[PDB]
Symmetry: D2
Amino acid sequence: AKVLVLYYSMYGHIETMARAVAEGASKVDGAEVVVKRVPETMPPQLFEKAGGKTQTAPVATPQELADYDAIIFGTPTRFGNMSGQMRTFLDQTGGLWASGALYGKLASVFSSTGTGGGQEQTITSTWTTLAHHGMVIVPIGYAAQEGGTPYGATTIAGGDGSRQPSQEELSIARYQGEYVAGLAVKLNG
Amino acid sequence: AKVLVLYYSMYGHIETMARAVAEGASKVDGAEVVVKRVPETMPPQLFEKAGGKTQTAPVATPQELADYDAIIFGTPTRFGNMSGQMRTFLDQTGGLWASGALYGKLASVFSSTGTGGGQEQTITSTWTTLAHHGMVIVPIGYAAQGGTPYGATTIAGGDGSRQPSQEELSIARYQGEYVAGLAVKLNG
Amino acid sequence: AKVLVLYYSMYGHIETMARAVAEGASKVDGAEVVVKRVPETMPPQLFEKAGGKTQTAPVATPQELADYDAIIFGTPTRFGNMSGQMRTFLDQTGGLWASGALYGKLASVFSSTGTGGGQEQTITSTWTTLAHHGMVIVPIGYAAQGGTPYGATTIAGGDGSRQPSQEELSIARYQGEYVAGLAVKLNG
Amino acid sequence: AKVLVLYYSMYGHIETMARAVAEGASKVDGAEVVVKRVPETMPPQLFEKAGGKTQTAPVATPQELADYDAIIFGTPTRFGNMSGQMRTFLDQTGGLWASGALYGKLASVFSSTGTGGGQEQTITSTWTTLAHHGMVIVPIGYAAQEGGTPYGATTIAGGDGSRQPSQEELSIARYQGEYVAGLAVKLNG
Ligand SMILES: Cc1cc2nc3c(=O)[nH]c(=O)nc-3n(C[C@H](O)[C@H](O)[C@H](O)COP(=O)(O)O)c2cc1C
Ligand SMILES: Cc1cc2nc3c(=O)[nH]c(=O)nc-3n(C[C@H](O)[C@H](O)[C@H](O)COP(=O)(O)O)c2cc1C
Ligand SMILES: Cc1cc2nc3c(=O)[nH]c(=O)nc-3n(C[C@H](O)[C@H](O)[C@H](O)COP(=O)(O)O)c2cc1C
Ligand SMILES: Cc1cc2nc3c(=O)[nH]c(=O)nc-3n(C[C@H](O)[C@H](O)[C@H](O)COP(=O)(O)O)c2cc1C
């Protein structure tokens, strides 16, 4: 099974989460895992001065999403929604929608926020788009307990962005990757 | 694989849909399908006076949900949420939650509305509860072609006179067949 | 302006919050505040055996909601939704809906959770129902500084032992005072 | 009271809706009404070939949103969310968020979809962002009935985009503008 971890990060928190997700998915016999980012939409000059952490992963094209059996989407919270960059990317998936290209594929979502507020809404409002594509949606449930959510792995970046993901947050992200990849093998070999 | 179509219905619209869902699921080789309803919470007297439709389906218990590989949940829209009867019932599943009893099982949702507005919120706000249980959620996507990609729906009309259409029931059957197919793929 | 704090609580966490909300609203010159609870739906015997907290607040009726200029609704999180007791109660407001009885009135929501997850969905899925009634919805935004901009919340802890904190109750009082201020501005 | 109708349109459906909203808000004694769009993010070449209807309204800056007492947001549905263009714009409102610049201002939302699916989610997922800004959220309720929603005015563009808004849809949009502007005067004079 092919698993895409597809993400947007501006300050590295989601990027770090993506790595943990991918490590988890890689644990699964039969799963092949790829990590990619959506294009930055900000001019580099502004991205630079805003203190952005330059992202170096291969940039995905909307078309290649059809190639995977499972897609795990990572986005930071922007006032309770996915980021503009992820929204702009997913708005380029009309071709795939028309052809049913993602229909029945596994989808799952992870996020990051400054202080907690909006993490749940970011994940569930992302599930909406995945459901229009006919994707099968995988939440994590009470995994953690067996300041997060049953909807997907999250991390807190802190008010000033200086917090880094904890071992426990990375563990939950890794679990999410492992579990989705396991589902993807059970369904697609 | 074992599939439960669990529904609430007060005027029979969700009941008609539930039957169609159960049929679609039945078409799948390897799938065993049961239809149950959640308990009415209205006193029988007021249900009657409200013009509520009486129903033959057996009443489910909260604890038996753990028996099934896939649960397809049917609720009418009540201002953009599931019904209080469905809500009350699911609030009784804390035991299953604690033991991880529904974790990883498939869930899917269908609904009915008077005039349309709220059918999407009903379905997605029911997904929320399914996700707390760690259920895998199955929307229907563009099979929905106003229906919804989130699951099958029917329009009851403002006075409730309208009955599920051929096309609406056909989408409902699609949904059962789709979820049942996934259940057999995952569980045999 | 008249403000109703309408709440459901099984272990007293939302009850404590409701009191604080009612106080904040009371601080507003021109605001008159009433606290009521929605009916328990559990039989008294099982409520008791469940370790439920008994409550002094008068029980509201669905129809009296139309009396108020602002309603602040308190519910614990039940897998990311309002409680079945709150859901059942609001399902009884079809009469108010038909007559436009709550249209334009202010609504605001607060909640309680065991461990946090679901508090945001509880609040926004309650807003849905308020919007069907045409109520104007008041979130609290960055006064929330894990709380939520959607309305005041408290963490009950996994075993329910934790009680609302000084800070959490202070946000709850802010919310009542804010909504009551808006009610007086709109209605005098 | 100053009322901003702030919108994104790619094929004109939301644009037509915006005009109706603005007409409604203008009916109100004491309300002054302005219509603006968010920047197109698409290169014009692509916008051209996709058959976009060039938008000609003044382009809003994130900063000027602080100047209004009420903002009515219009966006088409993109798989159950606001469009990338509106998301990208609202992601530039961090300055306003930090200063509480939109706190307590009135907000309301209208939408458009191809075939209905996702209109409710687009509106409520937009309310999320408005709530982070502390905005007071105004749905329309059962206005229509006294294929739409109580959350805000909507229009159906049809599967091929050829449908135009009906008189009844425009009437509901106008009502939304009138009602929000009326609220804005009652609160701010
Ligand atoms: C425009 C904008 C909106 C934001 N909204 C929220 C919010 O609603 N809640 C929150 O906790 N943090 C919010 N933040 C903080 C971001 O979520 C945080 O920077 C992000 O999680 C970091 O992830 P990254 O390092 O991968 O970019 C916001 C930040 C920006 C720039
Ligand atoms: C309390 C209550 C709230 C309702 N809210 C809505 C609504 O928000 N939108 C709508 O289109 N219909 C609404 N209706 C109509 C129901 O959705 C409709 O009667 C139901 O779908 C019929 O299904 P059933 O026959 O299976 O009970 C409501 C009905 C009641 C009794
Ligand atoms: C059926 C049920 C479901 C619950 N679901 C959640 C949940 O999803 N997330 C959470 O953090 N707590 C959950 N809890 C804990 C409640 O939110 C907690 O007991 C409540 O907030 C206490 O408020 P009260 O004392 O006012 O009743 C649940 C409790 C019950 C009984
Ligand atoms: C990327 C993309 C995603 C879309 N998703 C949906 C959808 O989920 N539901 C729907 O009915 N229409 C969908 N459509 C149709 C648009 O909503 C429609 O073009 C829009 O409402 C027209 O408004 P405008 O003329 O102002 O651009 C989508 C269109 C595009 C280009």
